[PDB]
Structure 1
Amino acid sequence: LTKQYEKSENDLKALQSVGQIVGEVLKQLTEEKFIVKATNGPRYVVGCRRQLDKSKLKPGTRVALDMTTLTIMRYLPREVDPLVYNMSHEDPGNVSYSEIGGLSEQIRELREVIELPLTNPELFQRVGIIPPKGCLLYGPPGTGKTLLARAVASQLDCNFLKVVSSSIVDKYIGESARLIREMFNYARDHQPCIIFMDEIDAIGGRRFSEGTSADREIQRTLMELLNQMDGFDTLHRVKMIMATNRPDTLDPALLRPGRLDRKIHIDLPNEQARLDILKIHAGPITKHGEIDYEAIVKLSDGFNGADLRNVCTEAGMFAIRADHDFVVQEDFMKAVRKVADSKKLESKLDYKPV
């Protein structure tokens, strides 16, 4: 008949297939005896087919097995642990470094840590100095540390990884360090990788002494990340970026150089820094051509890099009132005084560097 016939015979063909057990090979016993471990539990000794290229079956590899006879079927690449899949190819597209403004000094210092050693590795060799491994961002909130990470993410898109730093913990005594094992093993397999560890202050912190058995697991997740940072096996083409709001509460073993080579400071924006931020955010606004940004930037001191985006948002709200369509500079002066009214119940951040 039509394709209903051809779909049916492939449907009946597929049902005769069976599953296969997944296991790992410990060592090679003889030319036909192989000791394997099923990952759910018990270990066995098995044999190959005849032509599976037994030189390739190395200790530690992953391989499939049959059900009844339990013999070696086909070697497979290393596992990916689909929690790691959810943080690898998940980021939507972002526009480039044009939207971020006023941080051009801190922009270039991150470029020299990440992009330059992989694009131009010869020039560091010519001097003969190993490039730095990782960098740390810190500062008051709302100045764009996460947006800076989005700018680097949509720049070459090498192997960018987004750690939430709160799903690292779990309900069991294990499975927290074991996820960090599979993350860096995924980092070793794909060599030019970038790890982004946002909000480290959850998992990180200081070293206690007989606090709580709950803190013992959070610490056991902590100094494991210290160990896989430098440890025994050094890293290659792996750069880790981490950001927080309080750098004083971090561990001194976390903040020592070698694991965090350069500390990057992001501060509250200056007069010209608040000016061109406002130029970017007021770009797609159908304003009437009388707007003067100089008076607007004058009554905004101590603002973040994000309250100015709220200022641009609130001016359209006053345009929405009586549906005036065009935005008039009087609404910009009115919306500024509304925002600075709200910025009086959250202050005194000023955390000590490093």
Structure 2
Amino acid sequence: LKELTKQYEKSENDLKALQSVGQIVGEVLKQLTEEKFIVKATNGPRYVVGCRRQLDKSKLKPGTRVALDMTTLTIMRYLPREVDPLVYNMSHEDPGNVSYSEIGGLSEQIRELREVIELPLTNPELFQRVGIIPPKGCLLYGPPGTGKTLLARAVASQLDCNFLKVVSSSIVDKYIGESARLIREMFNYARDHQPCIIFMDEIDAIGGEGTSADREIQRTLMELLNQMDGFDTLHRVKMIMATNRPDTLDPALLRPGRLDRKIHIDLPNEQARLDILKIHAGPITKHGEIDYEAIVKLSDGFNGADLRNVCTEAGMFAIRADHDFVVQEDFMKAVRKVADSKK
């Protein structure tokens, strides 16, 4: 009888369930009085509805989802904000957890970028204690592939703050005013999701003359510049716009509260090649000893992005050969493969 009882009791809830009706899910959009709202069904007319007596008058603020009754059209209970990956914004792109230690040979540069970006977000007291508005924005310039993005990605991982990555060159679309609009949606997106490191990729495109299209670049800079030092809201989000060419960038863009700190990140540090390989080499099993030093000179002017491949490409050499890397002979050719074939 005990087995029959637990199933029978669940069945009794189901008999009640058959009775229960559905609520037309909708969103509130105004509050005319203390008993009247203007609710919109998800794909439905806008009904003027009241709220059930056992509801919080307040909690129902514009934007607050509700599920009104299907006949009374009186709201019966709030609901959480709908969550779907319908977002068009990289914002959800988790940086992923990357420790500062993983970027290699940028101790000073990483230290600086920590200052401007990390500080205003974590210990604002220091800035408000001295009375200066928190610094906002870091301009990371350096040779391509050196790893500007990663440092900007680790900073997000330490702070646990949402990161939005914009390929700046892409934002400059051909049709007029699209280019300003993409920048505008970025900062407007930030207001909704705080705090977000807005990492702009090569910024030479938008910042740095007589043609219709030669002033669209001019307009887009003005939109970028305004959204920073701009009436609206000053905000708490930070931007890490990184370029490859710092002479091109316009003067206004490099200012105290409008993007400061020209952190230079040159090709992997001489010693870094070790650290970078150290941080990027060890993962792959490789019992054999390493003459890293020769790999260092075997890899002069290496982009660092190449160094990541060096070890990985070596793994493919190992993926053929056998299954365990036991020889530096591998990195040598791997260094070549990540040089002549990386040209």
**TM-score, with length taken from structure 1:** 0.69
SS in 2 for 1:196: strand
SS in 2 for 1:166: helix
CA distance in 1: counterparts of 2:114 and 2:265, whole angstroms: 15
Superposed CA offset, 1:259-304 (max 9, x none) = 4233433221242232332333332455566532223222322211
Shift of 1:106: 1.6
CA distance in 1: counterparts of 2:8 and 2:179, whole angstroms: 50
Classify 1:185/1:291 alpha carbon distance in 2 versus 1 (closer, same or farther; 3 Å).
Answer: closer
Q: Which runs of 5+ in 2 are unaligned?
A: none
Classify 1:223/1:282 alpha carbon distance in 2 versus 1 (closer, same or farther; 3 Å).
Answer: same
**Higher helix share goes to which structure?**
2
Q: Given that residues 136 and 263 in structure 1 are in contact (C-alpha distance below 8 angstroms), is that contact kept between their aligned partners in structure 2?
A: yes
Superposed CA offset, 1:221-268 (max 9, x none) = 987666554433324432233445567887887676644233433221
Shift of 1:112: 0.5
CA distance in 2: counterparts of 1:43 and 1:217, whole angstroms: 40
Q: Please, which moves more after superposition, 52-61 or 142-151?
A: 52-61
Superposed CA offset, 1:24-68 (max 9, x none) = 555544444444455657544333333434355445655443333
Superposed CA offset, 1:191-241 (max 9, x none) = 544444556789999xxxx99999999999987666554433324432233
Superposed CA offset, 1:65-103 (max 9, x none) = 333322233345656564349856663853522221111
Classify 1:236/1:295 alpha carbon distance in 2 versus 1 (closer, same or farther; 3 Å).
Answer: same
Q: Please, which moves more after superposition, 105-114 or 153-162?
A: 153-162
CA distance in 2: counterparts of 1:55 and 1:24, whole angstroms: 15
Q: Given that residues 177 and 224 in structure 1 are in contact (C-alpha distance below 8 angstroms), is that contact kept between their aligned partners in structure 2?
A: yes
Classify 1:299/1:212 alpha carbon distance in 2 versus 1 (closer, same or farther; 3 Å).
Answer: same
Classify 1:111/1:297 alpha carbon distance in 2 versus 1 (closer, same or farther; 3 Å).
Answer: same
Shift of 1:16: 4.2
RMSD between superposed Cα atoms in Å = 5.0
Classify 1:341/1:29 alpha carbon distance in 2 versus 1 (closer, same or farther; 3 Å).
Answer: closer
CA distance in 1: counterparts of 2:219 and 2:46, whole angstroms: 29
Identity of aligned residues (%): 100
Classify 1:33/1:332 alpha carbon distance in 2 versus 1 (closer, same or farther; 3 Å).
Answer: closer
Q: Please, which moves more after superposition, 65-74 or 12-21?
A: 12-21
Q: Which runs of 5+ in 1 are unaligned?
A: 345-354
Shift of 1:183: 7.3
CA distance in 2: counterparts of 1:41 and 1:79, whole angstroms: 17
CA distance in 2: counterparts of 1:184 and 1:86, whole angstroms: 11
Q: Given that residues 133 and 260 in structure 1 are in contact (C-alpha distance below 8 angstroms), is that contact kept between their aligned partners in structure 2?
A: yes
CA distance in 1: counterparts of 2:338 and 2:267, whole angstroms: 16
Classify 1:340/1:260 alpha carbon distance in 2 versus 1 (closer, same or farther; 3 Å).
Answer: same
CA distance in 2: counterparts of 1:20 and 1:171, whole angstroms: 46
SS in 2 for 1:74: strand
Q: Please, which moves more after superposition, 216-225 or 119-128?
A: 216-225
Q: Given that residues 315 and 327 in structure 1 are in contact (C-alpha distance below 8 angstroms), is that contact kept between their aligned partners in structure 2?
A: no
Matches within 5 A, 1:191-206: 191-197=194-200
Q: Given that residues 21 and 64 in structure 1 are in contact (C-alpha distance below 8 angstroms), is that contact kept between their aligned partners in structure 2?
A: yes
CA distance in 1: counterparts of 2:26 and 2:188, whole angstroms: 18
Classify 1:14/1:294 alpha carbon distance in 2 versus 1 (closer, same or farther; 3 Å).
Answer: same
Instruction: Report the equivalent of 1:255.
Output: 254
SS in 2 for 1:85: coil
Q: Given that residues 81 and 182 in structure 1 are in contact (C-alpha distance below 8 angstroms), is that contact kept between their aligned partners in structure 2?
A: no
Classify 1:221/1:7 alpha carbon distance in 2 versus 1 (closer, same or farther; 3 Å).
Answer: farther
Q: Given that residues 319 and 327 in structure 1 are in contact (C-alpha distance below 8 angstroms), is that contact kept between their aligned partners in structure 2?
A: no
Classify 1:211/1:322 alpha carbon distance in 2 versus 1 (closer, same or farther; 3 Å).
Answer: same
